Design a protein around this nucleic acid. Structure first.
Ligand SMILES: Nc1ncnc2c1ncn2[C@@H]1O[C@H](COP(=O)(O)OP(=O)(O)OP(O)(O)=S)[C@@H](O)[C@H]1O
Ligand SMILES: Nc1ncnc2c1ncn2[C@@H]1O[C@H](COP(=O)(O)OP(=O)(O)OP(O)(O)=S)[C@@H](O)[C@H]1O
Ligand SMILES: [Mg+2]
Ligand SMILES: [Mg+2]
Ligand SMILES: [Mg+2]
Ligand SMILES: [Mg+2]
Lengths: 351, 358, 359, 352
DNA sequence: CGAATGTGTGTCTCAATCCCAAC
DNA sequence: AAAGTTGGGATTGAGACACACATTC
């Protein structure tokens, strides 16, 4: 009784307006499907952001379609919740996931599964924007009422939880009811920690989407989760992280002559021909062109070679009492009595 | 400029016979077909702030069948709630301006006079800062040198110092007459007290030179250039364009560094021009991210940009946290998917209809 | 006027270090990135026709690294094959103009004067008639009145009469010189006949020069041209599915639109509707002089400011257009690739533009 | 003893007038075509192009077409398709929509033979060739000729325009077509059926009214698909029954008088579905016609309120000046011929 | 209602710039 | 001979100002 937690594939994302970066997403996704089929898990939980846009290219739809057809043909039930890039924005248009309706269960509610003689409760919903949180809570509380009977329960959400993503969080932590496992998405940081006598998990992205995520890939490989829910409860021990192979990135900040030596030995000591970014001193570029074949592309820069405090700083640099300049600056801009304030300075503190 | 709009109501204004539209804090996206009433809303707001001019003809803004026009506008600035009301009945016009319930101005000219001081921005410089029309995204770039630094002063909040420098001219002169009261009489021990006041008045003028143009304004701007250059590179690089880096002179003229040469905005394509203009405006916003929380209005900025640059621009807008409320008009779907509130505008029988989606 | 472009080569022209581009008859679509190099091709065409101006700095148009510029252009007009070669080596410039193979002009100014003799259009009105740039599709309609009719004359083939007006000034003034050659000058008196004979003839010549004038026959022929252009303008304008009775065109070619409960002008319309009126009007003028001025037309990103729907319907318009022999359109939009006859793809490796044409 | 279905030009995704109802009418008519096809139980379905309207159609149209051809494939109906002009990818790495139907439909770019009830039938086809690469198309056709002589039953699937049928935009002539037992064609929405080269050439009309010039054909010959019985050794028109589907009704009115106003109401009431009215109506008649905006879908009707060479001489003579001189001088000056040699003749000979 | 206003327009100017030909 | 030097020409930007158009007291 094992399942796979995967999310944030962003199929169709064409980084750097470059064909190769568009293909690399397809390859990493196809390889995720390949490993999943090699494992043959009982259930696949895709927790959002499969596609990158609401009207993805025909190729991405064909790739995803044939992938989930393969998963359905091998008697693997796939449950999905719509991501933020998949919620239809206009009236008559449909989500891309509607093409996968006959191979994947799009979760907007409850469902129970029999796995070798045991009822497991799966529930989930689509991406709720921060405005409609009150509706979302009513969806969650309902999922609480229908769950007290089942000792094994899992919640699929494509949201941001407050203590994990502070920038754009749509839900707080205390609004989440107790579940054995949380299959979440929308943040590409791979996260795994205990939460309310259970395991909260962000499967993370599959390929490096935004540039802040190669620092993760060297530390935390990208891929999906394989969870062993055979026992009655869940811990961190029975969760194996599956890492996929991504496009290598090489970061250089060449402002010195020692920063050219770091290059070749790192560019060769990686799996595939990487992408270099950062800053290269102008004097180093022409002697750097020798290995532009052992690299993919070089998005590197060619480099050549608080007012309230600064006003007082300036006034003292010119030789004038800064605190007077500031207090007066406030006196007239706030349309206060500059007469009552100026008449004192000439008397007490002048020379 | 802690500027934020709330809602607007309009009667018989161009294509909008009657419409009340609510605004929200965030990326407010206005969508519709061509001529469905999108730009007309902002023409209405501009009418509320500044009365009809010769360029703002009533016969131009009246609904071609009707003979009157009415519009009220709620907004907040620096914590205060304001309500502007403008009407033209059958030949005579009137205006009321309320501040937190009770009225502040009752005549048209009084309302204009109040607006220009509450905003610190006039009619003409309002179009180069807050309300950017179609194609005029790069207009702020190509302005006259004097006009360029003039609108830059407002964009950076430096202009308020000039308000002191002129008011100092009122202050200095006054303290001069208290000196004239001794000077206009000292012709035709305690003589040191005569020199005290003289040295004091002499102090006031150098203080005025601190607030002057060449004094601290130019100094603060010169200290502001590198930051705006850094942010300008941060946002411009998001367009994956093949250029070394974007140099910003102290005169706010932009230079783009190519590998085998240096180009200017003249040589750049229209799309690259828009890339630079937008990323520079956002560099000014991100420069004073908390100093001047201004709202921004754009009318079709993604025009002249290809598919990829439109998309990248959308992600750029999503990562922008420096501007509290940015309202964008578009015919393109690349910005529907990134907005928080989407305002759909359609047209029935030459009459526009508004449908707000929160 | 049977003007059609053929092919163009260019060296070190801005982003194009080396590019050879052949044109075909029909709907030609130039596609590429922003800054890929689409407009630069027509900057090159304009460079070949008219030399660099003061605003058209060489430093503006040379590849910023390189030091020379070479452009040769092949075209046809009224059935003849012409080839222009303009170069600038390292401080010196040159220009050659060939007609059906053999050379016609060898100096820069000679080529310039000659090109202005074959097209009948100077620098100013070639950008308002044949090569319409960004946004200026509708500028001609909101233009200043005198300027508006000034370009209306050119796209109508009426300027051919203004040329006759000034070149007629030549003849009137020179025959007056033939009077001054006589005035300073048992045998006498057979010259009293010459006073009336030549003076009344010069009054006749000026009386004919007023026929070729603007307010004489140009305005008259324009008047007789308006109705047809109005009908075609509404036929092409109704394909935009817009909510208006009919499009009225004044004698002065300023446009009035009939709404049910009002009448609007181009001042009131939205940008996209301006562009609609503009393209429909240029297509109406083209449909009018189907044989008088069967000229090619070049558009730089016209579907800008148009929504998805108007882009599609505009494509379905361009497919039905048979009056214009060759229309080259540049777009960053996919709404026009599907309707084009020939697709010229323009990509850019770093800062160098490379062209992949698909026949 | 076999039957097959010939269908084309469905244009899924066509959003006429940017109107939701007109977009759904295409989906409905297509779904109903699939319904009738399922009712017939045909051996093979030949779709000869333009299934979708665009290269990037809406997801909804992709779902509808997908579920339709899955319905067809699961019922052991082989569907053959050739890409249309609205489905040929214009750029390189992007794919055509028809690639989503690879597991239910055979996309034809060559030959194939089928055994149906004990007889081999040769099917061949290719994608839409633009008018430029006609020789390439010809090089395909002659190839499809050599591979066909063994079979007494043969069918050719093309999405082109043939000369004697569309003079406007045809990409191939009639003599370029080799002899086949049946021609399953597309790209023209007028339904055509006629004998051709000891065979049957057929253009399956569109399924819904797409371009407004095609109601002229809809009322004469209904829109839908063909049902062909290839039981006999050869083919005739007798064993071809056209199956018509119901489309959105269109009502044309020219209400400028009251005698033309009863023609409106009595037809708007005596039609199948909520019709579409178009044409011209006097503004003094429009508001009393607006009473029927509930019994109609949409109203696309207009509101109505209430060479030089001769004219130059006519003008010059009308002003009182020899127009022959004005014209001959106009030509003398436009060329670089001697205006002096032409004017001195007039001043000497034909002056007063 | 007529004057006070800014707002735009057409047009005119001095001045600069840079291409183009010539010594 | 060769190289800059130099004036003819064309366009452009900024600076002035009467002439209107329309709002507004
Ligand atoms: N006085 C008027 N009476 C009635 N309708 C008018 C009047 N003036 C303009 N309109 C119409 O108002 C519409 C203009 O609205 P806009 O907001 O400019 O269009 P839009 O949707 O914004 O497209 P954009 O953004 O301007 S390109 C056009 O359809 C005009 O015909
Ligand atoms: N002298 C020059 N040397 C090198 N590159 C240049 C030079 N002048 C311009 N460029 C670049 O050449 C490119 C050409 O772009 P454009 O000529 O505008 O063509 P385009 O962008 O495809 O078409 P549009 O209509 O402008 S979007 C731009 O990226 C410029 O920055
Ligand atoms: Mg997400
Ligand atoms: Mg995501
Ligand atoms: Mg077709
Ligand atoms: Mg068709």
């Amino acid at each position: 009784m094992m399942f796979v937690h995967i999310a944030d594939n962003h199929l169709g994302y064409r980084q750097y307006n470059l064909d190769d970066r568009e293909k690399d997403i397809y390859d990493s996704f196809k390889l995720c499907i390949k490993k999943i089929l090699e494992i043959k898990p009982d259930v696949v939980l895709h927790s959002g952001d499969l596609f990158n846009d609401l009207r993805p290219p025909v190729k991405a739809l064909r790739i995803a379609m044939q992938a989930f057809k393969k998963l359905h043909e091998n008697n693997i039930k796939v449950y999905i919740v719509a991501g933020n890039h998949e919620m239809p924005r206009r009236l008559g248009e449909e989500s891309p996931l509607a093409l996968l309706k006959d191979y994947v269960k799009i979760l907007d509610g409850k469902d129970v599964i029999n796995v070798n003689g045991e009822e497991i409760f799966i529930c989930g919903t689509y991406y709720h924007k921060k405005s409609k949180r009150e509706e979302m809570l009513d969806k969650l509380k309902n999922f609480e009422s229908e769950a007290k009977n089942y000792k094994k329960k899992i919640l699929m959400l494509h949201q941001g939880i407050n203590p994990y993503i502070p920038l754009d969080y749509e839900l707080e932590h205390f609004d989440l009811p107790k579940f054995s496992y949380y299959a979440l998405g929308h943040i590409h940081k791979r996260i795994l920690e205990r939460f309310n006598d259970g395991i909260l998990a962000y499967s993370g992205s599959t390929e490096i989407i935004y540039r802040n995520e190669y620092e993760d890939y060297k530390k935390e490989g990208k891929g999906f989760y394989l969870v062993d829910f055979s026992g009655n409860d869940l811990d961190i021990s029975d969760i194996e992280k599956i890492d996929i192979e991504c496009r290598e990135f090489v970061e250089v900040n060449i402002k010195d002559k020692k920063s050219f030596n770091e290059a070749v030995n790192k560019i060769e000591r990686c799996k595939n021909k990487p992408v270099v970014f950062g800053k290269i001193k102008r004097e180093f570029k022409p002697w750097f062109d020798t290995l532009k074949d052992k690299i993919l592309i070089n998005k590197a820069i060619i480099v050549d070679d608080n007012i309230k405090e600064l006003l007082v700083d300036y006034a003292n640099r010119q030789g004038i009492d800064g605190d007077l300049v500031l207090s007066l600056y406030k006196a007239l801009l706030n349309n206060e009595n500059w007469k009552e304030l100026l008449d004192e300075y000439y008397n007490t503190k002048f020379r | 400029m802690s500027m934020i709009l709330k809602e607007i109501r309009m009667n018989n204004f161009k294509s909008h016979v009657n419409s009340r539209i609510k605004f929200e804090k965030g990326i407010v996206a206005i969508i519709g077909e061509n001529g469905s009433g999108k730009s007309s809303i902002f023409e209405a707001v501009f009418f509320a702030l500044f009365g009809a001019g010769s360029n703002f003809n009533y016969d131009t803004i009246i609904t071609k069948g009707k003979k009157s026009v009415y519009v009220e506008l709620d907004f907040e600035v620096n914590g205060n709630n304001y309500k502007i009301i403008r009407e033209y009945d059958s030949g005579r016009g009137g205006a009321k301006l309320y501040k937190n319930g009770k009225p502040y101005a009752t005549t048209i000219s009084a309302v204009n006079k109040a607006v220009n001081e509450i905003l610190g921005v006039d009619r003409n410089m309002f179009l180069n800062s807050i309300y950017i029309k179609q194609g005029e995204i790069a207009k702020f770039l190509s302005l006259k040198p004097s006009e360029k630094l003039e609108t830059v002063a407002k964009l950076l909040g430096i202009d308020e110092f000039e308000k002191c420098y002129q008011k100092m001219g009122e202050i200095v002169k006054e303290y001069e007459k208290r000196l004239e009261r001794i000077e206009g009489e000292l012709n035709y021990n305690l003589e040191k007290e005569k020199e005290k006041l003289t040295k004091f008045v002499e102090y006031l003028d150098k203080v005025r030179r601190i607030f002057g143009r060449n004094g601290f304004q130019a100094y603060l701007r010169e200290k502001y250039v590198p930051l705006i250059q850094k942010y300008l590179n941060e946002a411009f690089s998001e367009f994956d364009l093949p250029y070394s880096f974007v140099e910003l002179t102290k005169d706010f003229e932009v230079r783009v560094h190519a590998p085998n040469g240096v180009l200017t905005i003249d040589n750049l394509s229209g799309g690259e021009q828009i890339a630079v203009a937008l990323s520079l405006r956002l560099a000014i916003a991100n420069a004073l991210i908390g100093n001047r929380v201004e709202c921004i209005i754009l009318d079709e900025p993604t025009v002249y940009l290809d598919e990829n640059r439109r998309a990248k621009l959308a992600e750029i807008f999503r990562k922008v946290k420096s501007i509290p409320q940015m309202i964008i008009i578009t015919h393109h779907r690349e910005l529907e998917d990134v907005a928080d509130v989407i305002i759909n505008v359609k047209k029935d029988g030459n009459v526009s209809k508004v449908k707000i989606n929160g």
